[PDB]
Design a protein around this ligand. Sequence first.
Ligand SMILES: C[S@@+](CC[C@H](N)C(=O)[O-])C[C@H]1O[C@@H](n2cnc3c(N)ncnc32)[C@H](O)[C@@H]1O
Ligand SMILES: CN1CCC(=C2c3ccccc3C=Cc3ccccc32)CC1
Length: 244
Amino acid sequence: HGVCWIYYPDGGSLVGEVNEDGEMTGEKIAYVYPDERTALYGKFIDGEMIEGKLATLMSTEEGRPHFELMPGNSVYHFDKSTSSCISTNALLPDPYESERVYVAESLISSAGEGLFSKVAVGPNTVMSFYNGVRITHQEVDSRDWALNGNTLSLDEETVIDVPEPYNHVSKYCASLGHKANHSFTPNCIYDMFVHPRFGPIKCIRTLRAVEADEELTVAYGXXXXXXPEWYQVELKAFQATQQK
Ligand SMILES: C[S@@+](CC[C@H](N)C(=O)[O-])C[C@H]1O[C@@H](n2cnc3c(N)ncnc32)[C@H](O)[C@@H]1O
Ligand SMILES: CN1CCC(=C2c3ccccc3C=Cc3ccccc32)CC1
């Protein structure tokens, strides 16, 4: 009857008063990120973000949230990608992600850029979002493997991709999950995420506590889709660690 909270398994949530029809519709609805603190507050229709302004969940009293707007004019809307359009605002960063990760040269030799944590956080922490264009498994599997570096399977029907030129931060920085390099001793995994802006995508989630400026890596693996040695090299070394 009063305030409804809808939690997703990823730890994010929708919160506000429902309308006469029991829908999350109004001007005082919020999406709350998995930190249970960073929030997008404002106009939602049936749970879908029309105009969310950056906010902080300051306190909750008997399930009733108290939000304060952040300074400035950061505004967001449900903006699900398509087969060809990655975003209506490719250069508008995600504010939760901006506080937790950054891109820099990978510490892995000859591995291009990598993703690094800004913060010390514990296990199972959502750090970053893997948004991209949505394409079929047929398109990915039927093309040259060298076009599939940024592909990540979403579900039975869809593969997410971050194709050129969006693989460059100067062209696309709305999410950064695609900047995480591979490792066989990763500190992170890809995981399902339901994002108020990007819709259903995947996220990067730590497997264990990480330190500030630690590089974030994920096991990509185990044969690449479509149609490398750096994989083969580390695979062997990883194997050796298991025996005399
Ligand atoms: C999903 S992107 C990761 C970000 C990428 N390094 C960049 O600069 O945009 C995957 C690509 O990064 C490189 N890469 C990822 N892991 C690597 C590794 N362990 N060693 C060498 N290169 C790696 C490969 O070129 C791969 O195609
Ligand atoms: C985030 N995504 C990156 C690409 C990826 C690959 C891949 C694609 C092209 C070239 C190399 C790789 C490396 C490992 C891999 C292994 C198994 C399935 C997919 C992948 C899966 C994870």
